[PDB]
Amino acid sequence: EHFQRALELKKMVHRWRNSHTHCLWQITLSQRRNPYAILRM
Amino acid sequence: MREIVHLQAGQCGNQIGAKFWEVISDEHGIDPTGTYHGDSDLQLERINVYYNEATGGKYVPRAVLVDLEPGTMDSVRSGPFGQIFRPDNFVFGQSGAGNNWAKGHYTEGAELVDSVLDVVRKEAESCDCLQGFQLTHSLGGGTGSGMGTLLISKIREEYPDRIMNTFSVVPSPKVSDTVVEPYNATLSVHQLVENTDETYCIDNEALYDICFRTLKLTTPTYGDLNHLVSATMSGVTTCLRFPGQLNADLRKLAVNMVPFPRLHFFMPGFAPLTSRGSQQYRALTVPELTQQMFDAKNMMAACDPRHGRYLTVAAVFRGRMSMKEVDEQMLNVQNKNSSYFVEWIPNNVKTAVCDIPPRGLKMSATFIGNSTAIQELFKRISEQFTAMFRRKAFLHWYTGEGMDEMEFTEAESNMNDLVSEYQQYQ
Amino acid sequence: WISETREKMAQVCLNKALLNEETMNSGIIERDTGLPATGFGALFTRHSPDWSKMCTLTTYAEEYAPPYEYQPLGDPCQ
Amino acid sequence: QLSVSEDGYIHYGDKVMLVSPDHPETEADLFLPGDLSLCMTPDCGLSAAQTKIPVGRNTFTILCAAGEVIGQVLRYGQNFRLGITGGFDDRMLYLSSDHRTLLKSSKRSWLQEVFLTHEDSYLNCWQAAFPHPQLRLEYEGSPVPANTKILITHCHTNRGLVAHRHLFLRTYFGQEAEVAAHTYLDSHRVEKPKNHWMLVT
Amino acid sequence: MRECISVHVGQAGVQIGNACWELYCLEHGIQPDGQMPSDKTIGGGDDSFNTFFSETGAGKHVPRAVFVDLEPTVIDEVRTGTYRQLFHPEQLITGKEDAANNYARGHYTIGKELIDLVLDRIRKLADQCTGLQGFLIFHSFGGGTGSGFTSLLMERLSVDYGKKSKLEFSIYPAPQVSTAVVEPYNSILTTHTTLEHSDCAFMVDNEAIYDICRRNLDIERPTYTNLNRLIGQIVSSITASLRFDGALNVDLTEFQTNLVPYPRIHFPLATYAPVISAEKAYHEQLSVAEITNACFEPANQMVKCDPRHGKYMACCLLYRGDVVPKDVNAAIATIKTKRTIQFVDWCPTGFKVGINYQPPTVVPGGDLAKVQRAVCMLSNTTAIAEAWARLDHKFDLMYAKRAFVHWYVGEGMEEGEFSEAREDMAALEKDYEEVGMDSV
Amino acid sequence: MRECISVHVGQAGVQIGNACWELYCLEHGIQPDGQMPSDKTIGGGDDSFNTFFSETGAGKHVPRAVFVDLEPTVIDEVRTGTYRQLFHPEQLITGKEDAANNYARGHYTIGKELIDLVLDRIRKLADQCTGLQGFLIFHSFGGGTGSGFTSLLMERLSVDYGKKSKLEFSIYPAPQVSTAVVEPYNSILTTHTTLEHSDCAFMVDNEAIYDICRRNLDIERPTYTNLNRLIGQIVSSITASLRFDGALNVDLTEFQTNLVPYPRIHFPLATYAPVISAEKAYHEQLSVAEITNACFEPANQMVKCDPRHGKYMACCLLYRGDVVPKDVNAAIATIKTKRTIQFVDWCPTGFKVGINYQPPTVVPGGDLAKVQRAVCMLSNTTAIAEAWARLDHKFDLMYAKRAFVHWYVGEGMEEGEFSEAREDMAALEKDYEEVGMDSV
Ligand SMILES: Nc1nc2c(ncn2[C@@H]2O[C@H](COP(=O)(O)OP(=O)(O)OP(=O)(O)O)[C@@H](O)[C@H]2O)c(=O)[nH]1
Ligand SMILES: Nc1nc2c(ncn2[C@@H]2O[C@H](COP(=O)(O)OP(=O)(O)OP(=O)(O)O)[C@@H](O)[C@H]2O)c(=O)[nH]1
Ligand SMILES: Nc1nc2c(ncn2[C@@H]2O[C@H](COP(=O)(O)OP(=O)(O)O)[C@@H](O)[C@H]2O)c(=O)[nH]1
Ligand SMILES: [Mg+2]
Ligand SMILES: [Mg+2]
């Protein structure tokens, strides 16, 4: 059950890292994908 | 009212439907900044079939854009049509798959399925009436053939009532681009034949023929080849898309084109093709389109109708047209070359129409059809798979993610009895 | 007296149109009166492409016009 | 052309452009070098470019919010409006904001946000004040001179326009700076050079 | 964000990474003292450089690879050179005494004492490596540090980071030119260990580039810095799909899934097509077939062996710049008419394509011209069995006299490490004879 | 309000009472005259400094501190140093003869006549406060005043004030090197006496910061000032939340609540995270997870005692700079029970977190640069039971042949105090052995 709780907090930290990658990509997706539209202009 | 769910995967798929949502934006008259700037109130009538409404008067599609990496969703956001796709409609893993089915089907492609399954059930159940599912999968790679072709197996688990139709990218003929393609195409066919109900087949060396033999281009690109792939999707739905004389839909053609559950193996086409300088000099009338869409070089699946026989043939038409002189053109070609069907079916053709030709054009068509010389297409892969399995070549990429050889022993037993159906009808 | 890596990296360290976007307005057009016509009209190629438009009416919408003209009507009642 | 100041003080009806004075601070580590002037920004928004001459994209006409006359001496801690003329025949635009919710957050830092809008309300009035905390109530309601360090404060949030030169907004112009509204106070609880402003003529 | 934690080892890897890491500074807008002139990169830059350069609160772009040796005496020129403010003070691991053409001290005695401070730095650099699919290794079989330290790492990374990719831009010791003498011992023993732990091996050798810069380039009397840019461009077209846009961006698993069919065969070649001088290129004509058909003629290969004796078996491509994809279809279609260019029966498909936008940026002060189309066909071939049998033939002849052996028992080995690295190469010579064996 | 007095004992107390209080002068706006400069703008009603700096009317800020020594040649460097006008002369207590590396000299004979005046002055610096959070004791176990007079300061302080906070930061002897020889007699006979008269604690060994400075910085040939500066950087972060605001807060009553499970087991450690040089600060960018893992690594520890052998009894964290509570709480969660990190089962939640916005301040002439995140972590362990076991080892070794003992009996002292101060650590070695037992 110690293994159960430790690998529980393993799921929680993996989920938070996954969501950090996801959220970071969408907000700076807007930010860094504006300039190639300006270069095509 | 009978909306269509746009499904994709991979980097081939997203670089195909980057042009499908160009011509829907062209034909409904949609600026790439959200609003509407069209020339009539017919296009705004049936406009929620491909464009959900919101505040600000705008229109985002039912857009599902998937790959197993952010490798190609950077290019659609900064393409010409980029701020009409939704920021929450790019689903991604981290590591791209890269040329195996198993990590697309079991480990990397299969782990991220619980965000496609969210966005379908959030969107498609909130449609007032969906009509079915349309998915284009990169059939020759590892993500589209792996992850999207998993979803083809697992939304046909949920709703079996609807219609499944694909625009698949079957492997090319003479020049070949990836050595795992006599596996990731051999194995997907084992999944398709019980879990697809129309299968269109698209070949790029069969579509570089058109921009040299017909449309007269020295330098073609993908933004040139993919619009004849947007023809086979934006121009078959025209009975839902615009009013007119006679409206026959996508369910109305699977009744008329396939007679069987093991036959859904189509062979597409597109009628009004010519050069660019000679646009003024060829008259686009009744005899010209019917003379065009029956030849070998006006067909997109890289096979020959001479070596076998068709069974069924469908044809959208558009624009104001006469229906008598169209009929005597297609009653003739059922009868002049009487070898090139079977004599145990009465007729083969279906005529649907519309009112409005696609913008720029004036009198158009499209072409759908089953044929039993697509059995040659699925024999060149099964020729290659026999000359690889016996040396056990390349195989350790496949057991490393949990598959066995029993996915491999029966992905030729399926491709044997499939062609062992088309051999009688010959 | 210096080494080759330092030498090559030091060498790496040491290593118009008439109408512009500011001229596009004042360079005028449509002058000297060349004859504009098609075929053998011999003008430079004018703004004559087959422009892309959608046909607003259909068969039903054209042939079911009011057969005879009339004064439409008024609100049915107040 | 801006309007000259006879006496030192800034009346209404004067064409005046808004610029943050140059900072000797070093704690930020990211630093546009000096005298950063506020500007209208389209893709509208608002952001301060580098130091600029009066170009009409900068020029603010000092209007009246409490029904004042065209020429009237302005005192600290009193409402006024600062109006940017549009490029075409648009009459007036308003330096605006809103009390923060989750969804109206500023770009590149999730703070209060300041932008431009047509409509008129009390979210358009601003009042400027003395920088020294011990002297505010001594010099409150006194004629404010031409080119002097004064803080810009709202009258419904009591926050303040921040020269937030940590982050860069690359624009069409490429000159950069991010502007929000937030009050900063030191360990001695005094107003930073992050928030100062100067209304040049 | 996509990444590449590349690995360099030795005199080899630091006078290669003086010329390989020169280009990543040069192809992006990276100036040689950390920063950027802020002139906007082709496409999106903020994701294009993040395979190499990261950011701090000074705007300072600092790389993410590693340079290892067992001395300061060649690392110090990086430390006292043009690029001194750019690299990190603890990304440059040093030793004190070089392994001195030994596999004995290099693997165990002067390996174990210094392996541990390295592994802080990788696991402190691999924290923020979100998209990184492997490790890319630049080592030397014929030396001490490139072969002793390196295969000490190769038995360790596979334990820790599991089933990750490993591909090697490795400096193969050459067929005729002798730099050292007893380089069979450091090369055959490291290919007893790495061969079950790595997964692909790009193979280059120095003399077969010295052939090329005399006859394709016209430079008489070149150096390593002349040679190290041709390998230093081969690395940067392989990487070039993650970085700058194109029709066919290519993931890091496309390499090792299409160049290697088995576990114990993972030995391709390396070839790079438009190798032509800076002044004569504009009176010859660069066409896509001439760029394509140059790489199957053996004078452009970077291993002196011949495919006339053996057989091609798997291949690749990566075009770049102005590429019409119809011409790629109608250039490869001419190779399929040859019997002098032979395949085995069990790779009927054969190829792979990657396409970018960028024409290849040229180092200012170099040898090659400003070309606009480049393709590099990293490809398997079963005629390294002739090449491997000559670093093998002269080992059997030497051991019969039992020569040079006493300095290898004397630092932490037995005599049994010598026998099994002939027992392993015996079965590999019993292996390429059946991989290329036809089926009737 | 919210006052907290410093009481530093020894010449080590005065070498610490200069480097701490020079940071405190430039952490706030203080000049060495004492007055903040005119043209420095403060609103006046809000005073951050008022825990430490008192105030007259004119603006002079005299610290609430007293220094203790018994030989004048260390405070006379203070009395005519740079800060000779800031420190009020009454506060700097000097003897005339020093207790001279002994216990009973400074505990019964010589220190007896200097507890009279210091007790007079602490009632003149603790009447001014409304709420005194606690005193602090910075003493050295080695010398006579830091061992003898310090414990006699402790016992009298219990009578006079009862249950105020009395923390200590003690300069424990290093295990290998030392100032002297007779230091264990002064290091156990104070620890046996400062058990019931001590609230919370910390430890430092002098050789342990010597390890950190060379392996993390390039400051070769350090000095005690280059160690006394880091002691300032770790005391400031203890009290960082008292004066400046935060998303959370830690007061001085608050270590003992969450780190003292039993009122004799009050022995944490100390660690400061981002030890990195000014030319290494610019290159490597840092995150909150990056600074936490350093405090978990044994190299950053301020003791020569690895908690890998022991169980983390409880923890405390003091974050600083631009930290988010979101990413503070992510690396906290990333650290485990199953790692080399390992907790007792009777402490399941296991932490305390305090967040201060105000970034740490850089002193002229130090070593560390303008770093932007930091950690002051104070983790108890069962591993301190080997630190007592080595000092038990080397005290009964010196007590076997009954050495130096004539220097202890005749200085107003009894005899059996050696026989009980070895007995007392024997039970407290058992007490620290049963605090970490798994649940039965
Ligand atoms: N052509 C070329 N050859 C190189 C280059 N760098 C290293 N070499 C070859 O590498 C071999 C040199 O041996 P080392 O790499 O110094 O051996 P080591 O692995 O470093 O081991 P130690 O010398 O003991 O430190 C020679 O064959 C060189 O020709 C290079 O940049 N270009
Ligand atoms: N770790 C550390 N130890 C210090 C520092 N300064 C002094 N010390 C220690 O202080 C001890 C010196 O003895 P003290 O107690 O300070 O001398 P004292 O207070 O005059 O006592 P007596 O010499 O007996 O009169 C030695 O152990 C030094 O190592 C310091 O800055 N850091
Ligand atoms: N017609 C067309 N074909 C494409 C396009 N992009 C990729 N392809 C084809 O799809 C294949 C690429 O497979 P890929 O997408 O990498 O496989 P995946 O890893 O499963 O997504 C190649 O054979 C290409 O010829 C495109 O924009 N248009
Ligand atoms: Mg070396
Ligand atoms: Mg003393």
Residue numbers in the entry:
A (entry chain C): 11 to 51
B (entry chain JL): 1 to 426
C (entry chain 7): 89 to 103, 112 to 174
D (entry chain F): 55 to 97, 111 to 268
E (entry chain JK), F (entry chain MK): 1 to 440
Could you pull the original sentences from the published paper?
Motile cilia are eukaryotic organelles responsible for cellular locomotion and movement of extracellular fluids. The beat of motile cilia is generated by the axoneme, a circular arrangement of dynein-decorated doublet microtubules (DMTs). To address these questions, we used cryo-EM to build an atomic model of DMTs isolated from bovine respiratory cilia, a paradigm for all motile cilia with 9+2 axonemes. The structure identifies MIPs specific to vertebrate axonemes, a pentameric ODA-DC, and a mechanism that links the internal and external periodicities that, when disrupted genetically, causes impaired ciliary motility in the LRO and alteration in the chirality of visceral organs.
Five cryo-EM datasets were processed to determine the structure of the 48-nm repeat of the bovine DMT to a nominal resolution of 3.4 Å and a local resolution range of 3.2–4.0 Å. Of the identified 29 MIPs, 22 have orthologs in the atomic model of the Chlamydomonas DMT. The seven additional MIPs include four tektins (described below), C19orf71, EFCAB6, and FAM166B. Our structure conclusively places bovine tektins at the ribbon (protofilaments A10-A01) of the A tubule, which is consistent with their expected location in sea urchin sperm but inconsistent with their localization to the Chlamydomonas B tubule. Three-dimensional classification reveals that the bovine tektin bundle contains four or eight tektin filaments. At the center of the tektin bundle is C19orf71, a relatively unstructured protein we identified by denaturing the microtubule and performing mass spectrometry on the tektin-enriched sample. Our cryo-EM maps revealed the mammalian ODA-DC as a wave-like structure with 24-nm periodicity on the outside of protofilaments A07 and A08. The improved map quality allowed identification of five subunits: CCDC114, CCDC151, ARMC4, TTC25, and Calaxin (renamed from EFCAB1). The ODA-DC is linked to the internal MIP structure through two paralogous MIPs (Pierce1 and C15orf65). These MIPs bind to distinct regions of CFAP53 through their N termini and protrude through the microtubule wall to interact with identical regions of neighboring copies of the CCDC114/151 coiled coil through conserved C-terminal regions.
